[PDB]
Amino acid sequence: CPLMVKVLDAVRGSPAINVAVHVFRKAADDTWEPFASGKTSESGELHGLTTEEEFVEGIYKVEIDTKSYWKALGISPFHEHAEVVFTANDSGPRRYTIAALLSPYSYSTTAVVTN
Amino acid sequence: CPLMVKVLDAVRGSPAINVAVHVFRKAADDTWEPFASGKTSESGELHGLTTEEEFVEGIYKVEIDTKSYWKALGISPFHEHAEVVFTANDSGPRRYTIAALLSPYSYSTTAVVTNP
Amino acid sequence: CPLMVKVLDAVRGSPAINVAVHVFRKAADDTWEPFASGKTSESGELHGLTTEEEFVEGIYKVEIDTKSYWKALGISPFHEHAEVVFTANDSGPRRYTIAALLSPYSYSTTAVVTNP
Amino acid sequence: CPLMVKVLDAVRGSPAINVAVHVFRKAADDTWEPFASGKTSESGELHGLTTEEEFVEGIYKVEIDTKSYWKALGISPFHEHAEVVFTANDSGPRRYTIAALLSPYSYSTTAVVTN
């Protein structure tokens, strides 16, 4: 599991469950090609997005549909989503955990890059 | 100004100065049209990106070039940028301050939205 | 002023107004002496807590009463407060802006430290 | 495991390993009584701090020695520590994860409160 997305709801202090997450790889022509997606689970985590073979170096965008999450909860959000764009380098072995800490008018996203 | 971007360096506890900021607006055909861009100043602020006439409703994307920032300070950061995509002025004109707090592997983007 | 506290409500995307802020300084005997306190204003800022004469080196604690804040808005928040403990003016006088970004279960405290 | 502290280093995008964490319970006289402590592990996590029986309602302070962590890395930090003070309520069953996302001049701390 080279890439795991973790989403936390900073309003309820809970994992942000059932949050749509799309991953995209930047194609040569600078457009985003859908690559992987899922919904975060009960634990706010989205595993099994990609695999080691698939997850090659490149520029990836993780788009977290924070807005539907806030809509589902009835809280007016500021952002359309949360959108983590980063270069997977893979110079040494890497797991990437992208943790998005979400508030209606603020989000934080952190990469915990290990191995 | 209706749109202000502020950027802090959470490593140096400083304003993040000379950070490139690009603002786009989603056009009718769902492309991003270049809307405005600028550098944060010596206070980490980027004022005057736009005006209350120009800053109509729409979805805007603010791409703060955090990578060049960290790179110029010798850091290889995780993200290519800090993004902020939001619907602006949906229930009439607002002032938006987008505050981006930057660390090499984490950033936070907050909006202070006030009713002028 | 050498010490400014700014507090944002990340739920409402607003300044967090009328937030009680208490500043303490660690005395010789390692107790916290009350140093200064105030409310954030209508801009979420608390200026004039102290002066450059009064704001000597030491360890200071800033306790931002985030709980009363969230409680007055009907929210049961997680933390009793947002704290900031820091050594101030160790290598001469600095201006400190403490920016506290508040959510009911998360807060972030950042310092913008500039050399006047 | 009613209370788990997770510390992330936002500069290196790694778990913050070997970070001293002290937990205190507010005593009746308003002083902090040491209750539990540990060092975060390799995964940035500090488990086994307390137990269900021990972790009664009360006001707790989690003090994270962020400053020694930054010193160990040679980066001048702003804060003396990170200090999470909160009321354990236990109205329904709760695990508390206190995640501290640490930068030299910024920290974020979030409670993920589940069950």
Ligand SMILES: Cc1ccc(Nc2c(F)cccc2Cl)c(CC(=O)O)c1
């Ligand atoms: C009411 C208010 C809220 C937030 C900010 N900016 C800000 C922020 F939103 C997060 C971290 C640091 C800073 Cl400086 C500011 C601008 C400032 O005075 O630094 C004002």
Ligand SMILES: Cc1ccc(Nc2c(F)cccc2Cl)c(CC(=O)O)c1
């Ligand atoms: C239940 C839970 C809550 C939060 C986190 N992690 C986390 C993190 F890894 C970075 C920044 C904030 C947070 Cl909250 C985690 C750990 C993770 O799976 O990365 C678990």
